[PDB]
Design a protein around this nucleic acid. Structure first.
Lengths: 58, 66
DNA sequence: ACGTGATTTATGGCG
DNA sequence: GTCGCCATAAATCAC
C-alpha cells in the first residue's frame, strides 16, 4: 500500500527540485512511474497530495 | 512563495439515487436534471457535475482491467 | 490511532 | 452562445 523509501525519495527529489512548477507533464509522470515502480495515476495522486499538504504546512 | 501555493459530502441516500439514474442512463437529460435536483435537494449544477465525475470514474474502471 | 495513498465534490480551461 | 472531457483542488475516506 505505502510506497518504498526509494520511490518516495525519487518523488520528493522531483517535487522540491521543481518547486517553481511541481506539475509534471504526461511523459514526466510516466518517467516517474517507471522509476518508482508505481502507476501514472499513483504519480498524479502523489503530486496532488504533496502540493496541498505542502501549501497548508506553511 | 509561488502563484500555485495560493465541499459537502453527499448522504448515502443522495448517492444511491444519483447512482440509480447513472445505472439506468450514463447521460443526463434536461428534464431528469430538474427532477433529480428537486427530489435530492441539490442544485442542477451539482447533478450535472456528479454525472460528469461518475462518467470519469467509469473511465478509470474500464482502464483498470488492462 | 495514525498517516498516507485513494476517492469524493467542485472548478476552469479547452475542444 | 451550449456541452462534455480532462486535470486539478481541497476535503474526506479508509487500509
Amino acid at each position: 500500500r505505502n510506497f518504498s523509501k526509494q520511490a518516495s525519495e525519487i518523488l520528493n527529489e522531483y517535487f522540491y527540485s521543481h518547486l517553481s512548477n511541481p506539475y509534471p507533464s504526461e511523459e514526466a509522470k510516466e518517467e516517474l512511474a517507471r522509476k518508482c515502480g508505481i502507476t501514472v495515476s499513483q504519480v498524479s495522486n502523489w503530486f496532488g497530495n504533496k502540493r496541498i499538504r505542502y501549501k497548508k504546512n506553511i | 512563495f509561488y502563484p500555485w501555493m495560493a465541499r459537502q459530502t453527499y448522504t448515502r441516500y443522495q448517492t444511491l439515487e444519483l447512482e440509480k439514474e447513472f445505472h439506468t442512463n450514463h447521460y443526463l437529460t434536461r428534464r431528469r436534471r430538474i427532477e433529480m435536483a428537486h427530489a435530492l435537494c441539490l442544485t442542477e449544477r451539482q447533478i450535472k457535475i456528479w454525472f460528469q465525475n461518475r462518467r470519469m470514474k467509469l473511465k478509470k474502471e474500464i482502464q483498470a482491467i488492462k
